[PDB]
Amino acid sequence: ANQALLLSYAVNIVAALAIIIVGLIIARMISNAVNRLMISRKIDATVADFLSALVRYGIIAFTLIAALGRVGVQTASVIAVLGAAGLAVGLALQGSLSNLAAGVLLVMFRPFRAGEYVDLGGVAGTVLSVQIFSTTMRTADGKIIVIPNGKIIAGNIINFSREPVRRNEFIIGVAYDSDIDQVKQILTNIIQSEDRILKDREMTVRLNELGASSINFVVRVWSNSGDLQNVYWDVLERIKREFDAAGISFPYPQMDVNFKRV
Amino acid sequence: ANQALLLSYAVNIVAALAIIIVGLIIARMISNAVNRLMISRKIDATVADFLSALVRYGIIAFTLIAALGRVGVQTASVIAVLGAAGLAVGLALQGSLSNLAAGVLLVMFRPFRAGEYVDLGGVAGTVLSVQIFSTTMRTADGKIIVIPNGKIIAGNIINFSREPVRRNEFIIGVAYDSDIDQVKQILTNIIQSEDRILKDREMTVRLNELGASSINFVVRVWSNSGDLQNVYWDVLERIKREFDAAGISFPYPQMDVNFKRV
Amino acid sequence: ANQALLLSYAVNIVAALAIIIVGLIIARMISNAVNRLMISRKIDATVADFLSALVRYGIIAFTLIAALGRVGVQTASVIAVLGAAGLAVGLALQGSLSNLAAGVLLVMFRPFRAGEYVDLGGVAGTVLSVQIFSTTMRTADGKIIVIPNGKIIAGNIINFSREPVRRNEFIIGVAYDSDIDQVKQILTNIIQSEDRILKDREMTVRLNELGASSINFVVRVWSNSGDLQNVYWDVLERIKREFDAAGISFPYPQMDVNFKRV
Amino acid sequence: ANQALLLSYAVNIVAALAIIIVGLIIARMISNAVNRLMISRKIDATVADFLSALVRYGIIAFTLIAALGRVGVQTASVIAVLGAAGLAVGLALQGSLSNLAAGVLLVMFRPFRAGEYVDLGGVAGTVLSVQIFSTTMRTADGKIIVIPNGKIIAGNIINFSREPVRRNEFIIGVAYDSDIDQVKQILTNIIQSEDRILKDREMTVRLNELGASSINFVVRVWSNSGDLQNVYWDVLERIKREFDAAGISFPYPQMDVNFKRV
Amino acid sequence: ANQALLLSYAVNIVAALAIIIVGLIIARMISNAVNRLMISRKIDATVADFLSALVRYGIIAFTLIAALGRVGVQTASVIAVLGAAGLAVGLALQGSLSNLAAGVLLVMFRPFRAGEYVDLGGVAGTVLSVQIFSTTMRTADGKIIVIPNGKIIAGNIINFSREPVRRNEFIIGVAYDSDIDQVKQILTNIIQSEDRILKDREMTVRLNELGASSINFVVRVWSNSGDLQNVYWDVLERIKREFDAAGISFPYPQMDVNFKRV
Amino acid sequence: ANQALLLSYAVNIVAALAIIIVGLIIARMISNAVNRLMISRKIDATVADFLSALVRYGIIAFTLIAALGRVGVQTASVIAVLGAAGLAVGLALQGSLSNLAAGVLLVMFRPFRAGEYVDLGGVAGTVLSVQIFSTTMRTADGKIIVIPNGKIIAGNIINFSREPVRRNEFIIGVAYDSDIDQVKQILTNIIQSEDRILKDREMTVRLNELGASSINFVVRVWSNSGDLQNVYWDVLERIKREFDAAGISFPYPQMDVNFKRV
Amino acid sequence: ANQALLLSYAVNIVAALAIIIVGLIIARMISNAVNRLMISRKIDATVADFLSALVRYGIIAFTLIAALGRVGVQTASVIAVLGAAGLAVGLALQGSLSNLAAGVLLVMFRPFRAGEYVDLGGVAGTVLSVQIFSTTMRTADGKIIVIPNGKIIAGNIINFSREPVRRNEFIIGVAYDSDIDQVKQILTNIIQSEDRILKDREMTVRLNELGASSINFVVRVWSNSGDLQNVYWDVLERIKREFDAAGISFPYPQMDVNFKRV
Secondary structure (H helix, E strand, O other), X not given: OOHHHHHHHHHHHHHHHHHHHHHHHHHHHHHHHXXXXXXXXXXXXXXXXXXXXHHHHHHHHHHHHHHHHHOOOOHHHHHHHHHHHHHHHHHHHHHHHHHHHHHHHHHHHOOOOOOOEEEEOOEEEXXXXXXXXXXXXXXXXOOEEEXXXXXXXXXXXXXXXXXXXXXXXXXXXXXXXXXXXXXXXXHHHHHHOOOOOOOOOOEEEEEEEEOOOOEEEEEEEEEEHHHHHHHHHHHHHHHHHHHHHHOOOOOOOEEEEEEEEO | OOHHHHHHHXXXXXXXXXXXXXXXXXXXXXXXXXXXXXXXXXXXXXXXXXXXXXXXXXXXXXXHHHXXXXXXXXXXXXXXXXXXXXXXXXXXXXXXXXXXXXXXXXXXXXXXXXXXXXXXXXEEEEEEEEOOOEEEEEOOOOOEEEEEHHHHHHOOXXXXXXXXXXXXXXXXXXXXXXXXXXXXXXXXXXXXXXXOOOOOOOEEEEEEEEOOOOEEEEEEEEEEHHHHHHHHHHHHHHHHHHHHHXXXXXXOOEEEEEEEEO | OOHHXXXXXXXXXXXXXXXXXXXXXXXXXXXXXXXXXXXXXXXXXXXXXXXXXXXXXXXXXXXXXXXXXXXXXXXXXXXHHHXXXXXXXXXXXXXXXXXXXXXXXXXHHOOOOXXXXXXXXOEEEEEXXXXXXEEEEEOOOOOEEEEEHHHHHHOOEEEOOOOOEEEEEEEEEEOOOOOHHHHHHHHHHHHHOOOOOOOOOOEXXXXXXXXXXXXXXXXXXXXXXXXXXHHHHHHHHHHHHHHHHHOOOOOOOEEEEEEEEO | OOHHHHHHHHHHHHHHHHXXXXXXXXXXXXXXXXXXXXXXXXXXXXXHHHHXXXXXXXXXXXXXXXXXXXXXXXXXXXXXXXXXXXXXXXXXXXXXXXXXXXXHHHHHHOOOOOOOEEXXXXXXXXXXXXXXXXXXXXXXXXXXXEEEHHHHHHOOEEEOOOOOEEEEEXXXXXXXXXXXXXXXXXXXXXXXXXXXXXXXXXXXXXXXXXXXXXXXXXXXXEEEHHHHHHHHHHHHHHHHHHHHHHOOOOOOOXXXXXXXXX | OOHHHHHHHHHHHHHHHHHHHHHHHHHHHHHHHHHHHHHHOOOOHHHHHHHHHHHHHHHHHHHHHHHHHHOOOOHXXXXXXXXXXHXXXXXXXXXXXXXXXXXXXXXXXXXXXXXXXXXXXXXXXXXXXXXXXXXXXXXXXXXXXXXXXXHHHHOOEEEOOOOOEEEEEEEEEEOOOXXXXXXXXXXXXXXXXXXXXXXXXXXXXXXXXXXXXXXXXXXXXXXEHHHHHHHXXXXXXXXXXXXXXXXXXXXXOEEEEEEEEO | OOHHHHHHHHHHHHHHHHHHHHHHHHHHHHHHHHHHHHHHOOOOHHHHHHHHHHHHHHHHHHHHHHHHHHOOOOHHHHHHHHHXXXXXXXXXXXXXXXXXXXXXXXXXXXXXXXOOEEEEOOEEEXXXXXXXXXXXXXXXXXXXXXXXXXXXXXXXXXXXXXXXXXXXEEEEEEOOOOOHHHHHHHHHHHHHOOOOOOOOOOEEEEEEEEOOOOEEEEEEEEEEHHHHHHHHHHHHHHHHHHHHHHOOOOOOOEEEEEEEEO | OOHHHHHHHHHHHHHHHXXXXXXXXXXXXXXXXHHHHHHHOOOOHHHHHHHHHHHHHHHHHHHHHHHHHHOOOOHHHHHHHHHHHHHHHHHHHHHHHHHHHHHHHHHHHXXXXXXXXXXXXXXXXXXXEEOOOEEEEEOOOOOEEEEEHHHHHHOOEEEOOOOOEEEEEEEEEEOOOOOHXXXXXXXXXXXXXXXXXXXXXXXXXXXXXXXXXXXEEEEEEEEEHHHHHHHHHHHHXXXXXXXXXXXXXXXXXXXXXXXXXX
16 A cells, blocks of 8 residues: 555665665775875885775765665764674784884884894794795704794894994913913914905903903904804814914813812 | 753763764775775775774764763873773783684685694694684594694694605614614615605615614605505515524613522 | 652662563573584683673673663763673783683694603693693692693694604714724614614614714614614613624723823 | 654653663563573573673663664664773773682682692692682781682692692701711611501602712601601611710811911 | 954953863862762772872863863863873873882782892892882891882782791701711701700701712701701701711712723 | 755864863863862872872863763774873883872882981992982992882891991901911900990901911901991901011911922 | 756856865965964974964865765765765874874984984884884894884983993902902992093992802992993903902802712
8 A cells, every 4th residue: 555665765775786886896895096196195005005095995985885774774883883893803903013013113214124033023034025024034954934024123232244244253271371462363374364354343352251260361353144153163263273283282171170089 | 940051061962972873884884895995905894893993993982082071071081091991901802803813814825724734732633723812623532632823833733744755764773683674685686676655855774873782774755645654564565574594683672680599 | 748759769770670671691502502503513611701791791791881871871871881891801811812722622632642752842741631721730740730721822832742662862972993894783782682672773882982082983763662662772772782792892081191201 | 733743752762761671671580580590501600690691781772773763873872882891891891800700710620628738830739719800818827818719820829639649758968977878777667667658659769869968868758748747757767876875977068178388 | 353262262262261270270179089988988098099190180071071162162172182191191190100009019919028038030138118109128138129019919929927837947967877866866966956946847857868988968947037047057066066076977089990001 | 955964064073163162271280280289188299190190081082072972972982092091101101100199109118318328239339319219329439320219119228327326247267277366356355445336236257267378267246337338447457467576377368288209 | 848947957067166175275275374383483384384284174074074065965974975985085194193192202202212222112223213103223233223203202212322421240250268458449440540431430340249159249330331342351351361460260160079989
């Protein structure tokens, strides 16, 4: 009998569907325009994508509110349900968002770059790449370590490769009866005859400690980062050979034994 | 007397029940359509299920609000009660949601896969499977370790099997009076005569440390991941045999005893 | 004089009491129906009880709002007071809810079951039962340890009994002058003559380490979980007896003493 | 002149005071009735008191809202001020509420009871009582330790007294030249001649470890909880006496000294 | 021209000032009355002060809302601004509130009192006083330690002075060739001849451990708390003197040296 | 044509600017008056500044709401935007606010003062000043340590300088064959002949431990805080000299060597 | 037919676009004016930028609300969507905001400055610069460490370079038979003959400890920060030379061996 009400309900459903379609199209267009505008301003691609996604989902939320109000759902109900859904999605994506922001910061400020040897909170290796959510490094023995970006930015970043010049330290323990001046001059000759040691830097050769069984000399010399390990090995071998040749003894653990027979 | 009011109450209850039924049916249909649409777009099954569940429960919330408003419950009351119930359910399911998102991320980005040996925050073993809420690994001695996914993604992932080539390290301590060149050449011959050691990689044989009782040589060689342990064992046995044959002594702990009798 | 107002107040109080009674009855009936429906769908009893309790308390909240509005208390006041009470109850029951959800997950996914020996975050023992809020285990020496379920699911679960086959490891230190081939062949004969050692598994007998006073051999063999400890004991005793018979010496801590008398 | 307004203000103040008095009386009566109802249902006294306090304070909040609305204070203002006050009180009482819930759980599920020796997160002692907010234990040396209930339920509970039977473990180190069979048979005779050792339980006597200076035998026997320490002491003394009588030597730390005079 | 509007604005300002004054006076009076009522009910002074401060500030908030509404500021604006200010003050005072509640609990339940020696989470000393926010203790060497109350109640409280009787433990290591019965009887005579040792308590004198160089005897005796240290010192001195007199040797670290000359 | 609307818009903008100016002036005046009132009540300057800033910013918020409502911005929009801005500022200033409150508490209660030597959570030094956000101390070797105030109040405060009298402890290890009475009397004479040791305090000289190589005596004496280190040094030197004079031997690490030649 | 409605919709869209443009322009102008005003008041540039960004985004939010209300979107919907977007952005930028505030505090209060050697929570090095989100330091061996500002301000800051004068400490262990007065006078002569040691500061030379094998003397002297290490090295070398010349012996680890042959 009352055919007007059924027609009104049908036209309301059709209007809601039309609103949904038009709103989705408008959201896509506006989000794409905003993304292109942000990219043209040299803003980072990840940040632009995040902001454009926010814009698109906001416009879609407006469209959903309008359509559901058309089919009789109140604005407060739609807002509450969308808020609950967004809270659930945000709880699911909180860690991913933290890692995403951290990766953006890592790429932007470059505390380390690919190819550099770093120590990221107890693990050390050569950086391979900083991905969207985590950074991959390869250790000296060939292991692959994947570290989330947020964990990296939250802690200390120790970069071994950033400075072109680094320092070697030698701790040489010789017998107490060794001549101090002879040890000093032999070590000084060894480090002066080495061309890869920078002569304009610190060249410390000092007696450092009176140990339990030996007197320890400290040698601190600087070299280019690509020569540090080779310099250490060569200087150590030369120290061994020249101390053996000069009679300077590397002492075994000492022990004064007071003999008492009962 | 006033039979109109009772009939109105009955028809309101019937209308509420009809709204509940129709809303449940519509929620099921729309959730299934959205799930099929997301699956057809190659979106992950778990993500599609989560989003479809959100859509279905949102439509059910709309239906409940409508029906309870029909039976006289105000919209604000329904929103508050549904919010309290959803907050309780979310508190119950927070950890499960975190593990679910972490497992989705693990499957999507594949920091490790089944069959690879990994170290996940202090526990090492072969990955068996990444399940919905946790990952199962079997240790080298046969234990089964179950680790929640969120704990895995929150920490470092060390992958032992990702790189096809890995490095062995040998620390050999010989007596101080040993000839350095003889030790170097014997170790070099041992590592050159081994076919499983990659000759195009690093083949370091250097004197590394002047220890308390011995001078330590470091040997670093690379091999395919499937040959690393066998290479280590064979090279160690050959080092022992050839050092015994050549007279190079592995020294016991040394002690210089200064004898004093009172 | 104005007897109408007092009668109106009395009838409002009576209406509020009737609303309270009817709402309690309806809440009980609907909660029971929902619980039976969820149980008939093979849903877990604990989850069904939790959801039915939520439904019942929501209906009771609706009834309280209606009755208090009848006696003149505003809807916002009732919502705020019920929210404060629910927040207090939720603060009291947060840990219990976490443990309840964790126990449901433990029973559903079964990382361990009753009778299995597990290590749950530093404590090891045989699982007795997973209760509603905590899991009880008995240690090897007879202690009873009660661990909350949330603590269990939040950490690593190491299961000793899940795999039917497990591995034994032997570290045997022999004197440096021992013949490597003789040690290898004696250990190989010992592990081949043992029937409980699985011959289709790994049977590693290798020289593993050049220690301070001894050379260490590693023996890794597999056995059924019920034979692991007995195999370890029998193999160790046989190793001792056969090394004593063959003259292979287990060395005491060594010390090279360089005697110097002043 | 306008005496009507002053009379209206006075009557509003009087009405507010009457509302306050009546609401306090009604809150007390309803809270007491609810408390008696919950007690008659065998519900725990602490839970009943907590819920009755919530009911009473909710009714008092309703009364305050009504009275302050009578004297012209808006409902939103009263709700906001009461919410701020309740938030402050809840911040003050959060830890006490956590301890109260934990104590209720401890009394309800009884992981330990008064008189039992337990280890509660690193501290061990005999439980004296579980109070409303904390549990008191007395250590073996007479100290009194007070532990909050929430800390107890949040961690592992190790109960030493729950099982009627517990296990002793003996690690006996004998000289390498000792006869294995003689040691095994002497230990077996010692543990068989002890009546307090349960013969239907495990009676392990095995060689367990090849130590640096001794070979270690493990003896594991079970006894009633009240006899464990006495059994340990008696068995240890018998082991000492019988090993001395049989010539089995408990070895001092060994040292192979290779004498070299320069 | 329009002098009515200016007069209305002036009278609104005057009305707001009058409301402010009257509300402050009423808040003071009601807060004082509530404080006196709570004190007369034997409620703790600190709790009464806290609750009275809450009441006074709530009444002041009502007065501010009324006055600012008089001068045209909307109720929602006043509520939001007061909420922001209260949130800032609460953030500033959160730790102080926690310490205040903890101090109230400490005074109420008295886990320790002034003059008792306690160990509060790793620091031990004699309690001087429990103040409003922290507790002061003096260590054995005279240091003053101030510990916040919340930190105290959140952790274990070890009370050394609560029990009137405490236990001493002696670990005496004697040579392996010592007669067990003679050692036991000498220690038993020493502890029986001491009057300050409670003879109705445990008087354990047992062989406890077969150490590396000595056999260890455990002596556990009880005494009044004021005699524990003196008993320990006297018993130790008597043990030394009587073991010296009886020939029982306290052994130096032992070493079996196997002499080998190459 | 319609010049009335443009004039209305201009007059609304002018009214908004006038409201902004008048509100800023009123906020400044009222904040200054409140600050002077709080200062005149001897309230701490920092607390008065904080509260006056809150008052001023609240009045400015009221003014902004009024002006933006004048130019057509709704009250809810202004409240939401100001809330977002305040939340951002509060997130930025949370740690600073915590440190500010902690510094106020430190100055008010004075657990330490400038010039006193304290240990603040593992770092020890002389307090220089308590600033607004952090406290500066100078260590014994001249380092400057800056510690945030919140970290200081959250942890234990150990004050070395608060008590005028402190205790020294001496642990003297003598040979086992030393006469106990002679050692006791020599130490007693040393501590009695020292005038800076308080004779009305504890003067403990007891045998404390039977060590591995020596018997340890404990000496505990009290002195004024300014004499503690000098007393320790003088007493130690006197102990050395008098033990050397009396023949009491400070023993070297002992070792019983059981010689066995194979 | 109804061309009025379409024209109205078009004019509403045009009005919304005009509102957007005008609001963006006004936001830029007002934000720039506020930024210039804050800069002219000597306020920090970073704080001014943060506050100006807040002002600009608030005005943009007002403009968006107005325009979307023009095109029919309700104010509550716009507020909710903008709140969700702002919450997401704040979650992304929380750590960056914390680091920004911490860097502002570091620059403002200057606990350390560029060129000073500091220890920031376990890592020590020379400060290079305090950037917007992190601080860069170079270690003594040339490594580069990047530390987030929030981590720096949350922990202790140890400044090695702030004080112009610092203290050296020498622990010299000599043989027990050494003359105490001779050692004291030799050390005193060494430290008096050193010109870089401040004679107006502490010059402690005392016997500090009776060690296991030696008696330890403590020497504490002060010097300018630029001379500390050189003074330490020179004084140590002089101590060695003069003790060798005077016959004072640096003792090897001592051992009293009680010889027993069985």
